[PDB]
Design a protein around this ligand. Structure first.
Ligand SMILES: Cc1cn([C@H]2C[C@H](O)[C@@H](COP(=O)(O)OP(=O)(O)O)O2)c(=O)[nH]c1=O
Ligand SMILES: Cc1cn([C@H]2C[C@H](O)[C@@H](COP(=O)(O)OP(=O)(O)O)O2)c(=O)[nH]c1=O
Ligand SMILES: Cc1cn([C@H]2C[C@H](O)[C@@H](COP(=O)(O)OP(=O)(O)O)O2)c(=O)[nH]c1=O
Ligand SMILES: Cc1cn([C@H]2C[C@H](O)[C@@H](COP(=O)(O)OP(=O)(O)O)O2)c(=O)[nH]c1=O
Ligand SMILES: Cc1cn([C@H]2C[C@H](O)[C@@H](COP(=O)(O)OP(=O)(O)O)O2)c(=O)[nH]c1=O
Ligand SMILES: [Mg+2]
Ligand SMILES: [Mg+2]
Ligand SMILES: [Mg+2]
Ligand SMILES: [Mg+2]
Ligand SMILES: [Mg+2]
Lengths: 390, 346, 373, 390, 346
């Protein structure tokens, strides 16, 4: 138990963490696995939570003692998976059973340093959905009875993982969209670390392969004379999604100049072009424009304006943008680059995915600490940006 | 079970139906409960009668005499729960089938709990019908939850006049449907959530006669197609300005995924060029406005599914292949630009 | 090994799989107003001639039923009428008269200690069929789908707004086939059977009526049979008009492109009006061929046969692609008195064809139009 | 109690009914008020069920003894209403109380020949919504204990009157749309009469005034040189609604010929015009067309086609239609007049509202008995109709 | 009560607020439960404080000191249920106010049942606040269910800096808003279900300068307006072919009822003609395509409502008047054609 204490006399944490060979997974947990703690991994079914936990477990079995409890898959099924992933000549125990009373008995017997519950939805107890909240409460008290690290898996369902977020020590989300081949592990709530930490992984035939240096993916993905491509750090609620805007500006041949968007609001693009013609001075009147959000990402947020203006200008001008620079900003009809919400989160996320510059609205920076790995350029007008970029 | 070390972990009854065996993960395990779900009329009784005649069948849904007429077209096959339990102890049957488990519906949950304990009392395989396997429309049987196998396994059948006939080569469905060198058809390995669906994109490019060039799609997003054509004209060099274009997703499949772009581009080009594509080659890839063929999700599943359905080539994005094992039965061609693809294809 | 009771109505017998099986529960479902009471009064006045009928219902009064049932049949025979509701008062009369056939005119209007409880009453009715070995008919107004799994035979009396046919189909039959149908037409007297339905399709058609064609489409699993209508006429004005009602506009637009590019019809300068007769929505790939044939029929000014129908998705290469549920569609066409049916040739692999209909497998649109015109 | 009886020996009804001064209300009940019976009056709130029952009650109090039970309005409120409506120097008893036990006691005391429950929703009992089904069951048994006629009121709500329809003797519906100034009382289920019977009433400042001779309303409503007006007997589910289609065909002055509909599907009208031009021979190519469903009635049923074709033709031709003739029929693209559902109900409803002709599809008439008060003309083609009409 | 013969059926506390008295059907009856409903912020506490200072106020929602500051701007006025009941027997107050009745919400139903029995124990008038009268947005107080009065009664108030000020002549709201002979404005007595709303239709007819004539509506159905103009051109004889038309429902009232046709026709004509309408005259009537002014529902209510809000004329359809008593304060003009109306109006 803990006691009310004066803040000046609150002593700094002196924990002993357990690191895994996966540098990324360690950063996320804020150094490594803290013993006597409850970590929830959330995400859509199929993303690879079981796969990530099997990989962590085969690594942790080398220094501690792992008990992997799954009601979801059978014991034989896991053996076929886990041999591809790692080495299991070590103290890694597997238990394909679902009732907590039958689990508790095995925790006292083998006394395992690390416990993994593959699918909390598939664990029962007296008194498969409501009763998840009561099982996780009993699991947090179980972390103190035996002083063990416990991992909980939460599949994110259509209706009835976000419920347990407030009552666990660490909350991780494993998310990886149809458009990206890569899956990201983010800390939403961390009691033993920072929440701005991220771990990038790519699922390959073996299992999850870490992506240290992601700046190389964006550079491989760009062609030689790329032009009309630009990058925006947008938001899907609170998740900062990083997206590519594409533009093909080409002179009209026919009567009417064509305008066609996919993934961006058409009218938003129409205004952007008016502001580029009237403020930036681009003769777009007689130019066709095709615009696309790469990936099929819907881009419906004011912050995407600057990236789309830069994309268009890049195609019009036939001058490429840098693939490690990105742009954030609402564009006003006077050419101004207006403020946007969550600027600190967007700059953080850009830096972590290996970006070197980020153009942001100048007003958004008032008293914000900037990460040393990325050049934050505050801009005020569209002319200023295009001058800087081209 | 008790917990067990992973260094210390490791037989079934097969039927003549190779497909049904794969789904159950090798064959029928003697001590479990298998649920077959699906819409009424699909053939869950028909499939279970066929498995049973190969391998105690209990039905309230149809009469005894009705089943005899069915099952002859399709040995020790024997045809409420208290009256059933008494016959399970007497005959001691290795396989038990309950044709329709269906306040009975509130009691259905309590009957299946008692059936799982019955599988342990007398070590028997028990099949339950629910109007975890799912039989849904060719016809497909897929494993949603499998304790003794993989969930990615699928069994393709076709209901005929006799009963359900298994399907080995589903490539021959598109090949019969292909006419004598018919242009503007192409194939994509798309996804309906996680199920990889294989679909045909169709294009009719023809010169405009009057005034404005027409563009009409059915099953594909119109604007997606519009951009594809701009990229084919500006990057690939096809003069499509004065050409009408009609596009169709064969089957009435909705194709709303970035991966379909390349197949649509190839379809259009094929019709424009009047040069056909191969019916055993398929295409997967998002097409960028620079002509690039961008990466797509679930590439390993798509290549797997193409190979299994008897395809010989598959054009994929080149970047997607990093450290992925390729099946020996299919030629995976990684491409980077649309020009590269059309050069290879035509 | 069974002894059934036939009625004078050939159709109603086929549906039950030969006739009325004694000691059985038959549920007749449908909307209110279709004629379940009327059909059961007609069967009862016929069955009273060989057995003993007890007609129970509280939905209508005794005096009301007498006025109805004299128009329908003869009532000098052992036909007993009982306008009561609660069960216990019914059971007492079943033991007394010992009737071979029992009819309950609305299960919704019967009580035992009146919808939830309906499930418990029908359970007690099925055990009543064993105690006395009698055939019992139950009526279920559709507001019926709850009792379908716990009765011996399930019949549905259905009638879409466009056809004045009233079709009786067996959804679940323990003593017969489920494919069986009984076609009736409600007239001023009551329900008149339609034994030759082939003659009805051959009144709805005019003399020189081009641009009409028939498709066997599907409303889920029910195969609906529908008429596609086309009016192709040369444009007078600048732009050629295209207007659909009941079909997807873009689907029709592609069909016309395929007819011009593959079949060779000069439709560029022709206006086209298309309609699904009845206000049936036709949103299924299978309707393509019928719409193509309709248009061609109007363009060509050559009529189609009214007893021929067409099923098939039309590819942009002119091909006639496969469609789902082909065996059900052929079966439904045959039963409504059709003589030909054009289907996709690939759909026929190992399917047994009914002897009453000519199934023509086709592969291209050119082939079809050649055959048709 | 009643007994199983052979149909040949079932004797004809020999009842004694009570008539009211309102000829229409009597017809609906099939002659008059049957004693020892349960009659349900349904309809939207505000239509005038209380008003109709107060009028019936003040008339029935002259020959029997009425007990009007209302939980909905107070006793004093009803007195102010009922003096405008009729005479109450007679045995008319008012009881503003809601519990059935307290009601039962007063039924045994005064022994009233007629009982009215103003709002069954506002009557309570042990064991305001579920329990309506149990109260009406107890009311049907109460009709046999004392042999009295009982009227039940059912307000038709958004969600939770149509529930009691199967367990009462007579079901009446009082309906009267925003477009008609008149309210109609129809028998949906009648154990002591025909269901095709109808009673037309018009709510005036005093209360409900009966409309005997409705043929005069349609004739007053038409102007002198009316043209382009026609009448259709459409259906709103099962209720046959009678509606007026309006057309204004006038030559185009400008470039494009205008087409504008309100209440009819535009495309349906477009096809109708094509069939009139191609089959009937009307030169509508260079004519503007404005079409309106009078009342704001949505007309979305195939049967409305013929009425719209006749409306247009009437305006084009500048020849009026008869205001006591109406038209029913789907129009095929070959000019044919196709069959429609519920033809017998439509012909009935037309006749009852004082129509003299009705053009129907010829095929729809096979073995249907036609009412003697209306001329049913079966037609086969649009040309045939326009020939007959003009 | 016991049943009683109708030949044998037949006083209240009034407040200075004439409107509030009408709503309760004369005044406050001493032995009943009155519920005031509405959205938070509307002024149910403010209205009850004003009635109370004119006529025991119980509030958990606001403190005693807070109410004193409010109620002075706006005598024997005194400021859980067991602690309340004890004070009801002591002071014996003629009027009790519960400011906010608000598992309390499950118990709310049980508290109000005990409050209705409390009205009989001590014959007192009790007001209940629910975050049957409804206070909704000028501001209106309407009686939904009244046991001691009519439900068609309404009380109009306007919240000002002091508190709620009653409104006598709501005609003066449109009259202040009317400029010096402003054309193209007209008034309709429309209906929002059963509530007769009174609304202003606005039109700007102006000659087209280029190519196509514009038509733009806000609050009225576009097509309805389009037909009205065709009828004004073909029947009334207004050359609107080459005129642009902008139409607006003032307030953002949706006007989707046939009765609004005549007001819109008169509005357009007024703008076309550049002749104003009277601001105390209003118009009700569906307009047929022959120029006829057809009947409308609820005519008696509409005429009543117009008169009460200080209107002097009302143009109604002539057929609608058959056997209806007309109020002496308003000139009801029955019309039959649109030409007749425009002749009378201009
Ligand atoms: C480890 C591994 C998994 N898989 C498949 C099997 C799994 O069911 C699927 C999804 O991974 P999984 O980790 O089970 O997803 P979840 O996030 O729902 O726990 O990936 C392979 O195909 N190959 C492999 O080597
Ligand atoms: C076996 C068989 C079935 N059928 C028909 C009868 C069945 O009602 C229908 C559907 O098959 P069934 O297996 O009964 O469907 P389910 O159990 O999924 O509801 O197929 C045939 O026509 N011929 C056959 O040979
Ligand atoms: C027998 C008969 C019925 N009818 C009417 C009376 C019935 O109430 C109506 C509808 O038939 P009914 O069989 O009662 O419909 P269901 O029982 O399916 O709801 O048909 C006639 O008009 N004439 C007749 O000769
Ligand atoms: C009798 C009468 C009613 N009314 C009003 C008061 C009623 O609340 C209203 C509606 O009639 P009512 O009969 O109460 O409608 P419901 O169908 O809901 O029972 O008509 C008058 O204005 N004047 C009258 O003379
Ligand atoms: C009486 C009064 C209220 N108010 C404000 C304070 C209240 O919070 C607000 C709303 O009135 P109130 O009657 O409290 O709203 P309700 O009871 O309907 O929720 O009006 C003033 O600003 N000045 C005043 O003189
Ligand atoms: Mg998993
Ligand atoms: Mg079955
Ligand atoms: Mg009936
Ligand atoms: Mg009332
Ligand atoms: Mg308040």
């Amino acid at each position: 138990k803990t006691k009310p204490m004066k803040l000046a006399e609150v002593t700094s944490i002196n924990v002993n963490r357990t690191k895994t060979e996966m540098e990324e997974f360690n950063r996320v947990l804020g150094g490594g696995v803290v013993p006597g703690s409850l970590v929830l991994i959330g995400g859509d079914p199929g993303i690879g939570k079981s796969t990530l936990l099997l990989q962590v477990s085969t690594q942790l079995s080398q220094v501690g003692t792992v008990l992997y409890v799954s009601g979801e898959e059978s014991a034989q099924q896991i053996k076929l998976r886990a041999e591809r992933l790692g080495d299991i000549d070590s103290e890694f125990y597997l238990y394909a059973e679902t009732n907590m009373q039958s689990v508790r008995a095995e925790v006292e017997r083998i006394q395992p340093d690390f416990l993994i519950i593959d699918s909390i939805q598939t664990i029962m107890s007296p008194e498969s959905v409501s009763q998840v909240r009561e099982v996780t409460a009993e699991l947090m008290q179980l972390a103190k009875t035996n002083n063990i690290a416990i991992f909980i898996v939460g599949h994110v369902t259509k209706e009835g993982p976000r419920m347990l977020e407030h009552m666990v020590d660490t909350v991780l989300y494993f998310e990886g969209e149809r458009h990206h081949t890569f899956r990201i592990l983010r800390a939403v709530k961390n009691r033993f670390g920072s929440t701005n930490e991220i771990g990038i992984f790519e699922m390959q035939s073996g299992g999850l392969v870490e992506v240290l240096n992601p700046s190389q993916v964006f550079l491989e993905e760009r062609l030689d004379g790329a032009t009309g491509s630009s990058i925006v750090v947008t938001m899907e609620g609170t998740r900062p999604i990083l997206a590519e805007v594409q533009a093909l500006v080409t002179p009209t041949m026919f009567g009417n100049a064509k305008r066609t968007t996919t993934g961006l609001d058409f009218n938003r693009a129409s205004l952007i072009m008016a502001v580029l013609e009237k403020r930036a001075g681009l003769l777009l009147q007689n130019q066709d424009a095709y615009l696309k959000s790469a990936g099929g990402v819907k881009l419906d947020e004011p912050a995407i304006d600057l990236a789309v203006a830069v994309a268009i200008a890049s195609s019009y001008k036939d001058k490429p943008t840098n693939p490690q620079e990105c742009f954030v900003g609402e564009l006003g009809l006077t050419g101004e680059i207006r403020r946007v919400n969550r600027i600190e989160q967007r700059i953080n996320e850009a830096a972590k995915l290996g970006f070197t510059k980020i153009y942001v609205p100048k007003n958004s920076l008032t008293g914000i600490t900037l990460p040393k790995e990325i050049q934050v350029i505050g801009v005020t007008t569209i002319q200023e940006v295009l001058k800087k970029v081209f």
